[PDB]
């Protein structure tokens, strides 16, 4: 069963945003365009260029009315530490959702069951809750924020201009 | 339960390639970089720019040693007809897999159950059979062949030089 | 679990008829004599004379108040293309039902499970929805349209005047 | 889930042929073209001309190597009685299979559940056991034996000349 | 579980009563004494003297208010043919129930499952529906109508007079 | 499921045979024709002429090679007391099987579950163990030993001569 | 999981008392001291002196307000016959409960499964239904009726004088 | 499921006997006449005369070759303390089985489920392990030891000479 | 599945306290700081220093408003006997709960199933009924009443001033 | 069911020790005294005095032949970061096991299912694998390493001197 064109499942998670800690539910995504940016773990040796690339477009994303949610199986406490410790993660102004239970990760069928870590996946969600775009890659393959931005612009176009030759 | 980083399931399908009918199995994808390009239906009123953009990069894809498989729920007979009817589909030099059973579409968890059509999804499969990249979009949202090309080059780099960075 | 003398199961399909796309449900068959003509696939190398025969008798079938529905597992978009391509399929004035899900095909128990195509079967359905005649043949064995007319006329005579046989 | 292009299921039924009782199994259909002619019941008020029209073409069917099997939910004892006191059934040279259990009838998905009787169905079976043609009609609609004869000749043609379309 | 002293199950079968086709249900047996006479098949080489012996006592059975039902897995069309073909079966004025489904046969647990035929059984049913007497015999062993008549006379005596010392 | 034309189930019961206590099993019935005569209880106010009628034909039954077994839910101790108390039961020379467990009664599906007594049933068993004739009657209706004798004579004829036209 | 100090389960059995058949339920034991005397079978070769010794003390038991119930897996018809043709059973003034189903026997966990007979057990039941004394013996070991009489008198003493130890 | 005339279930318990701790299993009861004397608890306000009676007849019981086992849900450590405390319990020369698990108590179906104590029950067990006599009484009703001796002597007579009663 | 930070299950037990028998329920622990001190058995040869050490701090525990409940699988009758027999157990001013059913022991998941005795475990329960501290040791390893006292003072501090540090 | 006096369940976890990363299985605890020190999460605002107290006794623990395993649901990457970031955690010379799957945490029945974090528990394990001491506290209640040290010394004494008055 594909997760495309389906409504997102309810959740309640603690997150880090700009300093300090906030709580995010599925109620917060209502009437808003949402991006769920899943990544394995904090403090890994892999370059955090994927997250920093989104941070560079975040001002343009907020202009388009798009909320960004970076999610991992690490705690929100770890997100705060990684925000202060890493050079690139300091640019992150959007929410960094901690998912220690993995309930939100499992809502998007994105758990490495044997590792206990999220897969490298990105979800574009419309105001209705329906998933419009899915993008999953393996370890080492980078996700372009420019192509993500292009996809959102195309998704917002279909919503306003439904059905055309 | 995620489809990423898993070996592809065996299949047996009929396809259309450059005026000839050929049978493609999972054996044909072995030892080869493969791209499974799923799309809804033939002869629709939607612009065929998604499949045409892949055709433009196909020579560059064959240069990297990558096979391209365009798959839909239509028959391979329909693919031959669509290759002769449309101006953009005439450029398609790669294989056009016909999947009437939907078995190949079900293998990649990419079936619109109540429509009987494949979703707009792209899969990048390494020579071992493991899926490295998944890209799914809803009807209307276009897929970029240039970003697909970038991902394959990035996937081949990690396959060649693993453990480096950063 | 014999299919004969049972009411037809509800359906919702897209169809092509005279340069127009229409939606056909089980409601459209109500109060009318219907004929469901199933066939494998569009754009095949097999001679399309079976559909051509029904086209020749269609004027006579409409005269008896009988609706003809040609059903295939192909999309309704594919049917339009086939109407413009073949000389024999151009003669088709009746509706060409597209059944990508195979829901309507499985309703009449007529799906080639491992092939994903409809079998060569013809169904005669009365105004009530009850199936009166079933004719299934393998690939190659032709279906006679003039014998179908004989069967429909006989079915209409039994409906009008019950208990008038020996 | 359709019954077309599938091998026939094994059966063991008693039959009546030319004044003698014989037992027929799936082994008897092996290597032979077989036609299974199903009908509701014996001693019905409806014309037995459907079976009689097959009996007229039976000479031609035997020359083609086609065996005819008339199947009913009645006993083989009943078939003997219907053979004796009927003008049209007296012409039957082929076997009249009795199916009191309804096992053979259910093999072809041809049972009226509420009536306990077979439906008006004709099946064309090749030497391998694979079903090539199915014809099912309701009470009143007659089955054409000369059209059945045409179908068998067409089924034999594709068997000897495989995939000969169109040209 | 025993079939004796239990109410008969509902049924709807077509039958042949001297020249005419009728339909018999569990409703027809109500308020009346009933005898269900099961037998293998019509047009068998075995002697039909079982049904002929019941036919001789049938006039006395109607005087006692007892309805007789002859049941087999053959159709009611076959019962008519057997009536006007055999001299012994021609004496039958009682109803000949046809049971092609075997629903009535299975109600009395009397079906030869591998043969699709009824066993040689006789059931005596009172106005209430309760079975009072059961007699089952194997193929070849005959049943006596004179003994059956005696058993019904005794059953009607017990029904009218409760307790006998 | 019908009890007719099936092999009898194994049993081990104590019995009373004219003056002495014996034990009867399924082994004793083998190679011999057997008649199992079931009845409610000993010392009842109902007429014991059912068992007395069988006792009169018992000498002829032994000439035919038929063993008679009278079974009830009473103990074998009770059968002895009933033998030397009633003039009709005193005529019994055949075995009187006591079945306090009801195991043998349940083998023939003949137990009145709420009463704990046997129904009025008679079973005819051949040397192989196969039941050939069943006769069950409700409380009050009598069984005839003369008809029973006739049924055994017919059963032995069919066993020796297969197929009768 | 022991049966001591538990209320007796409901029952409906036929009994024999002084030439007349009566029906006894759990309602009849209400507000009355009850003794359930179980034994294997009627017409056994073993002495019926166990029942006879209870019959001798029955006059004293009735004065204390104690009802005696003799239970057997035999029918109430059998109890009448054993009452008529026995010297010791003729002295029985109390009820002789028949338990052909074994339902009452199973209520006291006193059934020999392989024999279908009750075991040699005696139960002392108070007006509330609560079991106060259980005595089960094997075939051969006699049950003392005068000791049973002592137990009932002791059971009545703790009922009227609750928790009077030692002093 | 009557407990009478059934073999005793295996057990492994610690016991106190004559200033010594010993382990008693079902093996120790084999080939010997055994008596299992169950009682609620140690150090109760209830008069310990029931155990005192068995102590007085113990010499006579050992003369008949009968072993006496007094079982309680208390520990074997508690039994030692009770042997030193009470004047009546000091007379106990037989083994006092401690059953904290209640395994041996549940074997004889003698557990007060909601109280966690053994009921007042006496069991006579033959050399084979078969239970011959069961006597259960409620709190307050005394158990007679002299009537127990009568029951054991009767049980031994039946074992020696079967079928010698009327 | 951990027992920590959960509300205690209801119980009804008989206990011995200062020469008197009293019934203790979960109602008695309400609004009160409670310590459930589990131990194997009475009258053992193991040094009773664990229970004696708690008795030394009992006056200091009552000063903090803490109730102490010593629990074992033995009867409350045995506790009275052990209070009079032992020199160290004579100091016990707190309640000694008798748990013959083992129901209270099962509530705290602290039963040696094959021994029928409680394990060496200490539980600290706040006025709300929530367990704040669990300490379990195998036979032989001693429990410190001073560290227990430290934990209760630390538990009362967090209850008073939550959210502070560091 | 209590976890006291039971053998530890098999596991395979990645850990941080002294720099750098190692893998620990149940095979590594064989023939050695082990301490499993569970704690909720890394980078929390709670003072890490519990872990630092054990670090002060670690030299004495290694003298007694005791291995210390600090476990949390955080990754081993996070453990390395927290080792470098925190003043007290820099003293940690023993292994810091990362348990993102929570499999090792669930082996000791120590998971806060709704939080996805380990409870505050300490386990003393002998060379055989058998758990000798369990110590669980709530948030805010400190665990004394001196009392832990005393318990281990007592546990090692019982192993060498088994059974005494």
DSSP chain B: --STT-BPPP-EEEEEETTEEEEEETTTTTTSEEEEEE-S-TT-SS-THHHHHHHHSHHHHHHTTEEEEEEESS-HHHHHHHHHH-SSGGG--SEEEE-SS-HHHHHTT-EETTTTEE-EEEEEE-TTSBEEEEEEE-TTPPPPHHHHHHHHHHHHHHHHSTT---
Judging contact as 3 or more Cβ pairs under 8 Å, the answer for H and G is yes
Distance CA(B72)–CA(C78), nearest Å, equals 13
Cβ neighbour number for residue B114 with a 10 Å cutoff: 9
Is D154 in contact with C133 (Cβ distance < 8 A)? no
Tell me the HSE value of C56 on the side-chain side, using a 13 A CA sphere: 11
CA dihedral in degrees (J23, J25, J27, J32; nearest 10)?
80
Subunit partners of chain J (3 or more CB pairs within 8 A): A, I
Rg (CA), chain F: 15
Distance CA(D65)–CA(D79), nearest Å, equals 24
List, as own/partner pairs, every contact residues I57-66 make where C-beta atoms lie below 8 angstroms and the sequence separation is at least 24, other chains included. Answer: I57/I145, I57/I146, I57/I148, I57/I149, I58/I93, I58/I94, I60/I149, I61/I35, I61/I149, I61/I152, I64/I33, I64/I152, I64/I153, I64/I156, I65/I32, I65/I33, I66/I32, I66/I33, I66/I34, I66/I35, I66/I152
Contact D3, D108 (CB under 8 A): yes
Task: Tell me the chain J residues in contact with residue A78 when contact means C-beta distances shorter than 8 Å.
Answer: 41-43, 74, 78
Distance CA(G153)–CA(A16), nearest Å, equals 81
Q: Residue J105: enclosing H or E segment and its boundaries?
A: helix J103-107
Give the one of C41, C78, C102 whose C-beta lies nearest to B116's C-beta. C102
Q: Residue H153: enclosing H or E segment and its boundaries?
A: helix H145-160
Is D46 in contact with C3 (Cβ distance < 8 A)? no
Distance CA(H15)–CA(H23), nearest Å, equals 6
What are the helix and strand counts (H, E) for chain G?
4, 9
- Residue to substitute from D76, D79, D100, interface E, most E β-carbons within 10 A: D100
Q: Which residue of I has its CA nearest to J1?
A: I109
Method underlying the structure: X-ray
Is G75 in contact with F102 (Cβ distance < 8 A)? no
CB pairs under 8 A between F and G: 65
Surface of H (124-153) touching I: CB under 8 A: none
Write down the residue that tokens 């729920």 correspond to: B73
Q: Which residue of D has its CA nearest to C156?
A: D141
Is A45 in contact with B166 (Cβ distance < 8 A)? yes
- Measure CA A88 to chain center: 17
- Residue to substitute from G4, G156, G160, G165, interface H, most H β-carbons within 10 A: G4
Peptide bond into D167 cis (omega under 30): yes
Task: Tell me the chain A residues in contact with residue B102 when contact means C-beta distances shorter than 8 Å.
Answer: none
Phi/psi at B162 (5° precision): -85, 145
Distance CA(I81)–CA(I140), nearest Å, equals 24
Contact G156, G64 (CB under 8 A): yes
Is J47 in contact with I165 (Cβ distance < 8 A)? yes
Peptide bond into G167 cis (omega under 30): yes
E122 dihedral zone (left: phi>0; alpha: psi -120 to 50; beta): beta
Give the one of E112, E119, E141 whose C-beta lies nearest to F155's C-beta. E141
**Cα distance from D120 to chain C (closest Cα, Å)?**
9
- Measure CA A154 to chain center: 18
CB-based contacts of H145, cutoff 8 Å, min separation 6: H50, H53, H54, H56, H57
Is G158 in contact with H150 (Cβ distance < 8 A)? no
Query: Please, where are the H alpha helices in H57-116?
Result: 58-63, 76-85, 103-107
DSSP one-letter string for I42-98: TT-SS-THHHHHHHHSHHHHHHTTEEEEEEESS-HHHHHHHHHH-SSGGG--SEEEE
Intra-chain end-to-end CA distance of chain J, in Å? 29
Write down the residue that tokens 């009898």 correspond to: F8
Is C78 in contact with B42 (Cβ distance < 8 A)? yes
Task: Tell me the chain J residues in contact with residue I158 when contact means C-beta distances shorter than 8 Å.
Answer: 138-141
**Residues J35, J39, J43, J45, CA torsion sign:** negative
Distance CA(D150)–CA(D144), nearest Å, equals 10
- Residue to substitute from G39, G47, G116, G119, interface F, most F β-carbons within 10 A: G116
Q: Which residue of A has its CA nearest to B45?
A: A165
The residues that bridge with A22 in the sheet, in sequence order, are A15
CB-based contacts of D53, cutoff 8 Å, min separation 6: D144, D145, D146
Distance CA(E154)–CA(F142), nearest Å, equals 7
With b meaning 16 or more CB within 10 Å and e meaning fewer, what string describes D1-28?
ebbbeeebeebebbbbbeeeeeebebeb
Task: Tell me the chain I residues in contact with residue H78 when contact means C-beta distances shorter than 8 Å.
Answer: 41-43, 74, 78, 81
Surface of H (5-64) touching G: CB under 8 A: 5, 45-47
Q: What is the DSSP letter of I9?
A: P
**Cα distance from H114 to chain I (closest Cα, Å)?**
7
Q: Is B81 on the interface with C (CB under 8 A)?
A: yes
Distance CA(G75)–CA(F117), nearest Å, equals 9
* DSSP-based three-state secondary structure for E63: helix
Peptide bond into H64 cis (omega under 30): no
Distance CA(F118)–CA(E2), nearest Å, equals 11
Query: Please, where are the H alpha helices in G20-144?
Result: 49-64, 76-84, 103-107
Distance CA(D121)–CA(D132), nearest Å, equals 13
* DSSP-based three-state secondary structure for E16: strand
Distance CA(B71)–CA(B75), nearest Å, equals 10
Q: What is the DSSP letter of H10?
A: P
Contact E143, E51 (CB under 8 A): no
Enter the tokens of residue F84: 């030397």
Q: Which residue of G has its CA nearest to F118?
A: G100
Phi/psi at A75 (5° precision): -75, 160
G81 dihedral zone (left: phi>0; alpha: psi -120 to 50; beta): alpha
**Cα distance from A151 to chain J (closest Cα, Å)?**
33
Distance CA(G34)–CA(G123), nearest Å, equals 8
Q: Residue F16: enclosing H or E segment and its boundaries?
A: strand F12-17
Phi/psi at F71 (5° precision): -115, 135
- Residue to substitute from B4, B46, B139, interface A, most A β-carbons within 10 A: B4
Contact J73, J102 (CB under 8 A): yes
Contact E68, E33 (CB under 8 A): no
Cβ neighbour number for residue B87 with a 10 Å cutoff: 8
Contact J37, J97 (CB under 8 A): no
Contact B73, B41 (CB under 8 A): yes
Q: Is J119 on the interface with A (CB under 8 A)?
A: no
Task: Tell me the chain J residues in contact with residue I150 when contact means C-beta distances shorter than 8 Å.
Answer: 144
Q: Residue G98: enclosing H or E segment and its boundaries?
A: strand G95-98
Is E165 in contact with F45 (Cβ distance < 8 A)? yes
Q: Is H106 on the interface with I (CB under 8 A)?
A: no
CB-based contacts of E118, cutoff 8 Å, min separation 6: E38, E39, E40, E71, E72, E73, E99, E102, E105, E110, E111, E112
Which of I110, I84, I100 is CA-nearest to residue I14? I100
The catalytic residue positions of H are 47
Which of H78, H46, H48 is CA-nearest to residue I98? H78
CA dihedral in degrees (I15, I19, I22, I28; nearest 10)?
-80
- The C-alpha angle J123, J125, J129, rounded to 5 degrees, equals 130
CB pairs under 8 A between A and J: 65
Give the one of G49, G141, G163 whose C-beta lies nearest to H132's C-beta. G141
Is B77 in contact with C101 (Cβ distance < 8 A)? no
Q: Which residue of C has its CA nearest to D152?
A: C141
Enter the tokens of residue E7: 């109410």
Residue-range domains of chain A with CATH = 1-165 (3.40.30.10)
The residues that bridge with A67 in the sheet, in sequence order, are A34
Is G138 in contact with H150 (Cβ distance < 8 A)? no
Q: Which residue of A has its CA nearest to B137?
A: A133
Task: Tell me the chain E residues in contact with residue D74 when contact means C-beta distances shorter than 8 Å.
Answer: 74-75, 78
* DSSP-based three-state secondary structure for D145: helix
What is the DSSP pairing of strand I131-137 with strand J12-16?
unpaired
Options E4, E47, E64, E154, the catalytic residue: E47
Task: Tell me the chain D residues in contact with residue C137 when contact means C-beta distances shorter than 8 Å.
Answer: 4, 132-134, 151
Rg (CA), chain D: 15
Question: In Å, what resolution does this model reach?
Answer: 3.4
Enter the tokens of residue E75: 């159709």
Which of J161, J164, J160 is CA-nearest to residue J33? J160
Phi/psi at I103 (5° precision): -60, -45
Judging contact as 3 or more Cβ pairs under 8 Å, the answer for C and B is yes
Enter the tokens of residue C56: 């020749």
- Residue to substitute from H111, H135, H142, H161, interface G, most G β-carbons within 10 A: H135
Write down the residue that tokens 């969600």 correspond to: A125
Is B43 in contact with C80 (Cβ distance < 8 A)? yes
Q: Is E165 on the interface with F (CB under 8 A)?
A: yes
**Residues B143, B144, B149, B150, CA torsion sign:** negative
Distance CA(J78)–CA(J96), nearest Å, equals 10
Is C43 in contact with B77 (Cβ distance < 8 A)? yes
The catalytic residue positions of A are 47
CB pairs under 8 A between I and J: 103
Cβ neighbour number for residue H141 with a 10 Å cutoff: 19
Q: Is F115 on the interface with G (CB under 8 A)?
A: yes
Give the one of A5, A109, A155 whose C-beta lies nearest to B2's C-beta. A109
């Amino acid at each position: 069963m594909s997760l495309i064109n389906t409504k997102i499942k309810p959740f309640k998670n603690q997150a880090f945003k700009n300093g300090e800690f906030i709580e995010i539910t599925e109620k917060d995504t209502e009437g808003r365009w949402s991006v769920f940016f899943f990544y394995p773990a904090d403090f890994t040796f892999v370059c955090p260029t994927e997250l920093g690339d989104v941070a560079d477009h975040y001002e343009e994303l907020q202009k388009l009315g798009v909320d960004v949610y970076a999610v991992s199986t690490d705690t929100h406490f770890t997100h705060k530490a990684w925000h202060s410790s890493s050079e690139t993660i300091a640019k992150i102004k959007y929410a960094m959702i901690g998912d220690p239970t993995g309930a939100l990760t499992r809502n998007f069928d994105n758990m490495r069951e044997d590792e206990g870590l999220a897969d490298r996946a990105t979800f574009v969600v419309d105001p209705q809750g329906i998933i419009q775009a899915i993008e999953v890659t393996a370890e080492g393959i980078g996700r372009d924020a420019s192509d993500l931005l292009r996809k959102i612009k195309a998704a917002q176009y279909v919503a306003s201009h439904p059905g055309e030759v």
